[PDB]
From a paper:
PTPRU is a member of the R2B receptor family, which includes PTPRK, PTPRM and PTPRT, characterised by large extracellular domains that mediate homophilic interactions and tandem intracellular PTP domains. PTPRU possesses evolutionarily conserved sequence changes to key catalytic motifs including non-canonical WPD (WPE) and pTyr recognition loop sequences (GSRQ rather than KNRY), as well as a unique threonine in the PTP loop. Here, we demonstrate through biochemical and structural studies that PTPRU is unique amongst the receptor-linked protein tyrosine phosphatases (RPTPs) in possessing two pseudophosphatase domains. Despite lacking catalytic activity, PTPRU can recruit substrates of catalytically active paralogs supporting a model where PTPRU functions as a scaffold to compete for binding to protein substrates.
The overall fold of PTPRU-D1 closely resembles related phosphatase domains (RMSD of 1.0 Å2 over 237 Cα atoms with PTPRK). The most striking difference is the absence of an ordered pTyr recognition loop. The structure and sequence of this loop is well conserved across the PTPs, with the key tyrosine of the ‘KNRY’ motif creating an active site pocket deep enough to exclude pSer/Thr residues, whilst favourably stacking with the phenol ring of bound pTyr substrates. In the PTPRU crystal structure residues 904–925 encompassing the pTyr recognition loop region are disordered, resulting in almost complete loss of the pocket that would normally bind the pTyr substrate. The conformation of this loop is highly conserved in classical PTPs, but in PTPRU-D1 this loop is arranged such that the sidechain of T1089 is in close proximity to the active site cysteine (3.0 Å between T1089 OG1 and C1085 SG atoms, Fig. 2dii). The T1089 sidechain forms a hydrogen bond with the backbone amide of R1091 capping the adjacent helix. A threonine at this position in the PTP loop is unique to the PTPRU-D1 domain and the more common hydrophobic residues at this position (Ala, Val, and Ile) are not capable of forming an equivalent interaction. This new loop orientation blocks the catalytic cysteine and would directly interfere with pTyr binding. Residues C1121 to M1127 in PTPRU are not well ordered and challenging to build in a single, reliable conformation in the electron density suggesting it may adopt multiple conformations. In PTP1B this renders the enzyme inactive but is reversible upon reduction and is proposed to be a protective intermediate during redox-regulated inhibition. This conformation of the PTPRU-D1 PTP loop is not induced by oxidation, it is instead present in the reduced form rendering the enzyme unable to bind pTyr.
Residue numbers in the entry: 872 to 903, 926 to 1146
Write the structure that this text describes.
């Protein structure tokens, strides 16, 4: 059952009583391909695999996100080919390339320009802020007459160990991506690193922010439950589950 925005602080405090039992029980309850993004296969190896990406519904439209991993080098062409096919104009990346000295994602975009398969990609602008970067790319594809423009919103401030201490920076980032992504747009391609749960947190916040604005209620439990069925994009810790509540609370002031 959904929680009225007016009752959300009460709800959170009740879920925190008895040493946080309510959050623990609800998070653990989540634990015990139709929505795959289709790409036409290309002349190559008949045995070649295809990029794994899944559609996720948003509050206002179906297939609002494509959730995927940061592409391995052998999947970088299929990644940009999917961006092209889907007319994606916003990518969300929620990891540094390197965190605590460990490679979390390989750079899949040019510093200047490069060609991947039949797609030429040029970096046309970088906007660097304290907690995120906006990179603007132009794509050209052999046989096609016009550029396709893509913005990558790269959040750099997520702690390696846990959730952000305050939600304020992430909420500003989400607000920026929403304001930059037309209703005209294709799906938002979103990735982090394998098994961090950050993509799932972002998606739930994106959807619940819209639901709070439009209905004055939030239904985080059923949103996350739906997210289990759709992908390996699953909230990885009880702390993340609580943080989703703390972040929506802040956005509702
Ligand atoms: Cl294609
Ligand atoms: Cl980085």
């Amino acid at each position: 059952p959904a929680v009225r925005v007016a009752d959300l602080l009460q709800h959170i405090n009740q879920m925190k009583t008895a040493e946080g039992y309510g959050f623990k029980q609800e998070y653990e309850s989540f634990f015990e391909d139709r929505h795959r993004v289709k790409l036409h296969p290309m002349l190559g190896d008949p045995s070649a695999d295809y990029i794994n990406a899944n559609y996720i519904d948003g509050y206002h439209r179906s297939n609002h996100f494509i959730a995927t991993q940061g592409p391995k080098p052998e999947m970088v062409y299929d990644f940009w080919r999917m961006v092209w096919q889907e007319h994606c104009s916003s990518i969300v990346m929620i990891t540094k390339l390197v965190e605590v000295g460990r490679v979390k994602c390989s750079r899949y975009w040019p510093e200047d320009s490069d060609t991947y398969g039949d797609i030429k990609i040029m970096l046309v602008k970088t906007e660097t802020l304290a907690e995120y970067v906006v990179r603007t790319f132009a794509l050209e594809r052999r046989g096609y007459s016009a550029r396709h423009e893509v913005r990558q919103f790269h959040f750099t401030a997520w702690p390696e160990h846990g959730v952000p201490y305050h939600a304020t920076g992430l909420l500003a980032f989400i607000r920026r991506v929403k304001a930059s992504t037309p209703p005209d747009a294709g799906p938002i391609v979103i990735h982090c690193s394998a098994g961090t749960g950050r993509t799932g947190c972002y998606i739930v916040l994106d959807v619940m922010l819209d639901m709070a604005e439009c209905e004055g209620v939030v239904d985080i439990y059923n949103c996350v439950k739906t997210l289990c069925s759709r992908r390996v994009n699953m909230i990885q810790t009880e702390e993340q589950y609580i943080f989703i509540h703390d972040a929506i609370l802040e956005a509702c002031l």
